[PDB]
Amino acid sequence: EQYYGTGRRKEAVARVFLRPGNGKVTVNGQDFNEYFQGLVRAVAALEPLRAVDALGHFDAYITVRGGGKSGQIDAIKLGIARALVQYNPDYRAKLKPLGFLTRDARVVERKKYGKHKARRAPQYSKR
Amino acid sequence: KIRIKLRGFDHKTLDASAQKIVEAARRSGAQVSGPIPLPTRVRRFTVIRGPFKHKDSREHFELRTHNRLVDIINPNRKTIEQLMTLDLPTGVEIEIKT
Amino acid sequence: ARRRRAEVRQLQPDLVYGDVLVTAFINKIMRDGKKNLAARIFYDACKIIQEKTGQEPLKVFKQAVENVKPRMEVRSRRVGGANYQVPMEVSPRRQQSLALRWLVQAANQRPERRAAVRIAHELMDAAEGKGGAVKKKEDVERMAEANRAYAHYRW
Amino acid sequence: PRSLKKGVFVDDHLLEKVLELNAKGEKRLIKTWSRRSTIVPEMVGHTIAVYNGKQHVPVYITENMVGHKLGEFAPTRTYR
Amino acid sequence: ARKALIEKAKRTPKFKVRAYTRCVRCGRARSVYRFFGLCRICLRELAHKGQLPGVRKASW
Amino acid sequence: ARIAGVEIPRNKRVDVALTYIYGIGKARAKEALEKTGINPATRVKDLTEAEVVRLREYVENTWKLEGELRAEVAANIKRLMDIGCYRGLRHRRGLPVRGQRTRTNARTRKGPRKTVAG
Amino acid sequence: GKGDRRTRRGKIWRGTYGKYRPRK
RNA sequence: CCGGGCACUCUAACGGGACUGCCCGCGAAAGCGGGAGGAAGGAGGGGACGACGUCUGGUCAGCAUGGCCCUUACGGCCUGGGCGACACACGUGCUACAAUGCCCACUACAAAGCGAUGCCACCCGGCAACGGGGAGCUAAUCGCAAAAAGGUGGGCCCAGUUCGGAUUGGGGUCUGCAACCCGACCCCAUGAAGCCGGAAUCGCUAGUAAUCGCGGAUCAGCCAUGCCGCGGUGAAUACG
Ligand SMILES: [Mg+2]
Ligand SMILES: [Mg+2]
Ligand SMILES: [Mg+2]
Ligand SMILES: [Mg+2]
Ligand SMILES: [Mg+2]
Ligand SMILES: [Mg+2]
Ligand SMILES: [Mg+2]
Ligand SMILES: [Mg+2]
Ligand SMILES: [Mg+2]
Ligand SMILES: [Mg+2]
Ligand SMILES: [Mg+2]
Ligand SMILES: [Mg+2]
Ligand SMILES: [Mg+2]
Ligand SMILES: [Mg+2]
Ligand SMILES: [Mg+2]
Ligand SMILES: [Mg+2]
Ligand SMILES: [Mg+2]
Ligand SMILES: [Mg+2]
Ligand SMILES: [Mg+2]
Ligand SMILES: [Mg+2]
Ligand SMILES: [Mg+2]
Ligand SMILES: [Mg+2]
Ligand SMILES: [Mg+2]
Ligand SMILES: [Mg+2]
Ligand SMILES: [Mg+2]
Ligand SMILES: [Mg+2]
Ligand SMILES: [Mg+2]
Ligand SMILES: [Mg+2]
Ligand SMILES: [Mg+2]
Ligand SMILES: [Mg+2]
Ligand SMILES: [Mg+2]
Ligand SMILES: [Mg+2]
Ligand SMILES: [Mg+2]
Ligand SMILES: [Mg+2]
Ligand SMILES: [Mg+2]
Ligand SMILES: [Mg+2]
Ligand SMILES: [Zn+2]
């Protein structure tokens, strides 16, 4: 009836509710392409479905909040891959070589005193 | 409507103060809402490490105020019975609104 | 890299062509971390190359990149006082970065007003054996085979 | 670009001093340490010694200079 | 600093704008945090000592 | 097309072309194009003379302009120069006026560098 | 750029408001 | 938004989780190479943490302090001025020289903090800074608030310009006893240099550099482009 996964990337979450249907995707009460589409990378979020040829099987209702839109796209990608395995756990063996079910642990590195932005060192003269 | 606002710099003091309050109100009142945790207000102070510069050596400290909510629903007496003065914790601080 | 071999970064396959060389070329177009703008340049430049020419932009992009790959180049090496320009082969990895960097640099030296126009026109001229990038390549292979007298300092 | 917006500020030190000098006719030089104050029409024709921080400098006050402050005419720095 | 310069405490300042912070412990003039009423140097000495409740070492 | 005292912008958008007048910036041209009811986007060459005369009418005597302005400004200097004003002193020696620092970076007001020995 | 105060971006760079950058 | 619920996001307290534990190969061992499983692997990423000592390093001007000097004065009060001087020189930065750009309208996605006479929704006046009125909030409930780059639409068409925002004239707002020296802010007009910088030299190895905004400490105000934090987008390259 319905399948779900959380998905997270770089201070951003996107609840993915997968439901069998025509193949139309809703995000925050808007079309998938009324939220994105001006952003080239947008189609990456749906790469889990293309790997298993699940395009036309499911609809998707998504709630994304937090971060910026590009991390929102990666967070969708994970939530879509997570729900996709809860549907069929045999989809792990196919989804895993691509790494769609891997969380991306890279987050903004904290600024450090004595530098300018956490690595960039103030420039000096010596003379 | 009985709001109980717990605040303190030590998170162990609040939980030691909140859990004691539910154990008194659960013997009398309805199913209490529970020790719901509110977000922390974190004041930071960055300070240059020595006197008389070495500007680029600062160490900073933080002081955190943790918050909790209680919300006993329909308490009448045997709730307020154990609730007059029985609490141990010192650094805790409690407010009540109706 | 003093300790290790400094493994190569593996880039994401392209969203459109599924090719990693595209993304790598897109990244050289990017400035100040605006990858969305840099992609729209390249892809709108693929419309230009595919309309003004009845060919497939993917194959022209590769055929252009190939003609800018240098087979040799010169480096310096300190020997007995002042150093020397020493000719030696180019790693297949370095032929990647040099050809790509040159194409982007050449195209922005171009007269054309808009960016995607310059990319497409450069790629076309480069794939035909002319244009600014192939000059930097034919001029480098001229350094070698000129300093060919120092082919014994190979290192 | 200069702004006091209303109640154009003048110190009470010389204000009561200058308006009383008018009832008795124009007086001679005047001691002033308050350059905070502006200039008002009823000063024109007098002379006022403003302070530099070091010295008292006589300032003939004229029609054209009503809008300004004392000390605009008593400069502080000494260069060349 | 100077004892006579701790006239801030007695302010009656004759103008509100002449009130300044004046770290209480060491009599510091310059850098006085307003929440502890202490200077940055006194603040650091009292923090390490443990006489400021709830003030830990910041780390993240 | 002559709008102010002799002033001929041409071939560009009218609003941007009025900027070529002395006492007119973007703010005043956008205002004249408004109160005279003229499309700002039209090329100067395409301007109706009936609109051109309406523009001249407004602009010429609404604000003081090219010749008078320069004179008024210049007379507004002499005035605070002929009085002993401090502001007028800084105008005499050719130094910044708004209370900037001169120990460095006076270059725009100070006639770029003239170096000495050390 | 960010230096022109009577441009919008030069207003947000100074954190101010006015004719060239209203509030609402 | 109400009814209602805690599943989810989240908030903030306790735990689980990774150990070269498992497979192959090498090895005497410690370990190294590779593979599966796993959110994560060989120190997963970032902090706090800096040994015996060195430089007679820095600070008696934060504080403490030995000794030496001053005591109608080196002390004390005040008003005013100075710490802002300018023929020059260096350091550190900001804003730029533009079309991968600028401007205008419309529209979308953050994290971290601050606020009781303070943050100030909202309404009226004002082109505006701001003023009047006034709601809410002892604040996951109200407010600062708008994130900006971004996206869609339009304008500019390679020009000292619709680039650039110095300088200067003029009008005004606010703080403050008081803006002359010497404040920030708004509006009009002015619209300089600068068309990617000689010798030389600086930073960074991955959410890094680059770029984009946001907040805070001190503070009535502010010369903060500084400092300390926050998140958005997000590279190149390392043979050796
Ligand atoms: Mg950043
Ligand atoms: Mg962090
Ligand atoms: Mg520094
Ligand atoms: Mg410092
Ligand atoms: Mg250190
Ligand atoms: Mg030598
Ligand atoms: Mg040599
Ligand atoms: Mg040489
Ligand atoms: Mg040589
Ligand atoms: Mg002392
Ligand atoms: Mg003060
Ligand atoms: Mg004391
Ligand atoms: Mg501009
Ligand atoms: Mg680690
Ligand atoms: Mg560690
Ligand atoms: Mg660790
Ligand atoms: Mg010494
Ligand atoms: Mg020492
Ligand atoms: Mg002490
Ligand atoms: Mg100084
Ligand atoms: Mg001199
Ligand atoms: Mg001299
Ligand atoms: Mg609002
Ligand atoms: Mg209005
Ligand atoms: Mg709440
Ligand atoms: Mg709420
Ligand atoms: Mg609450
Ligand atoms: Mg556009
Ligand atoms: Mg020039
Ligand atoms: Mg211009
Ligand atoms: Mg140009
Ligand atoms: Mg390193
Ligand atoms: Mg402030
Ligand atoms: Mg200044
Ligand atoms: Mg600031
Ligand atoms: Mg700021
Ligand atoms: Zn102190």
UniProtKB/Swiss-Prot annotation, chain A:
Keywords: Ribonucleoprotein, Ribosomal protein, RNA-binding, rRNA-binding, tRNA-binding. SUPFAM superfamilies: Ribosomal protein S5 domain 2-like. InterPro entries: Ribosomal_Su5_D2-typ_SF (IPR020568), Ribosomal_uS9 (IPR000754), Ribosomal_uS9_bac/plastid (IPR023035), Ribosomal_uS9_CS (IPR020574), Ribsml_uS5_D2-typ_fold_subgr (IPR014721). Disulfide bonds: none annotated. GO terms for cellular component: cytosolic small ribosomal subunit. The keyword Protein biosynthesis does not apply. It comes from the Bacteria. One of its GO terms (biological process) is translation. One of its GO terms (molecular function) is rRNA binding. It holds the Pfam family Ribosomal_S9. The keyword Transmembrane helix does not apply. HAMAP family: Ribosomal_uS9_B. Part of the top of the head of the 30S subunit. The C-terminal region penetrates the head emerging in the P-site where it contacts tRNA. Part of the 30S ribosomal subunit. Contacts proteins S7 and S10. Belongs to the universal ribosomal protein uS9 family. This is Small ribosomal subunit protein uS9. It comes from Thermus thermophilus (strain ATCC 27634 / DSM 579 / HB8).
From Swiss-Prot, chain D:
SUPFAM superfamilies: Ribosomal protein S19 (SSF54570). Keywords: Ribonucleoprotein, Ribosomal protein, RNA-binding, rRNA-binding. GO terms for molecular function: rRNA binding; structural constituent of ribosome. One of its GO terms (biological process) is translation. InterPro entries: Ribosomal_uS19, Ribosomal_uS19_bac-type, Ribosomal_uS19_CS, Ribosomal_uS19_SF. The keyword Transit peptide does not apply. GO terms for cellular component: cytoplasm; small ribosomal subunit. PROSITE patterns: RIBOSOMAL_S19. The keyword Nucleus does not apply. Part of the 30S ribosomal subunit. Forms a loose dimer with protein S13. HAMAP family: Ribosomal_uS19. Located at the top of the head of the 30S subunit, extending towards the 50S subunit, which it may contact in the 70S complex. Contacts several RNA helices of the 16S rRNA. Belongs to the universal ribosomal protein uS19 family. This is Small ribosomal subunit protein uS19. It comes from Thermus thermophilus (strain ATCC 27634 / DSM 579 / HB8). The lineage of its organism: Bacteria, Thermotogati, Deinococcota, Deinococci, Thermales.
From Swiss-Prot, chain E:
GO terms for cellular component: cytoplasm; small ribosomal subunit. Zn(2+) binds at residues 23, 26, 39, 42. GO terms for molecular function: rRNA binding; structural constituent of ribosome; zinc ion binding. Disulfide bonds: none annotated. Binds 1 zinc ion per subunit. SUPFAM superfamilies: Glucocorticoid receptor-like (DNA-binding domain). Its cofactor is Zn(2+). NCBIfam families: PRK08061.1 (NF005974). This is Small ribosomal subunit protein uS14. It comes from Thermus thermophilus (strain ATCC 27634 / DSM 579 / HB8). The lineage of its organism: Bacteria, Thermotogati, Deinococcota, Deinococci, Thermales.
UniProtKB/Swiss-Prot annotation, chain F:
NCBIfam families: uS13_bact. Signal peptide: none annotated. GO terms for molecular function: rRNA binding; structural constituent of ribosome; tRNA binding. It comes from the Bacteria. The gene is rpsM. GO terms for biological process: translation. HAMAP family: Ribosomal_uS13. Residues 94-118 are annotated as: Disordered. Located at the top of the head of the 30S subunit, it contacts several helices of the 16S rRNA. In the 70S ribosome structure it contacts the 23S rRNA (bridge B1a) and protein L5 of the 50S subunit (bridge B1b), connecting the top of the two subunits; these bridges are in contact with the A site and P site tRNAs respectively and are implicated in movement during ribosome translocation. Separately contacts the tRNAs in the A and P sites. This is Small ribosomal subunit protein uS13. One of its GO terms (cellular component) is cytosol. Keywords: Ribonucleoprotein, Ribosomal protein, RNA-binding, rRNA-binding, tRNA-binding. Part of the 30S ribosomal subunit. Forms a loose heterodimer with protein S19. Forms two bridges to the 50S subunit in the 70S ribosome, contacting protein L5 and the 23S rRNA; these bridges are straddled by the 5S rRNA. Belongs to the universal ribosomal protein uS13 family.
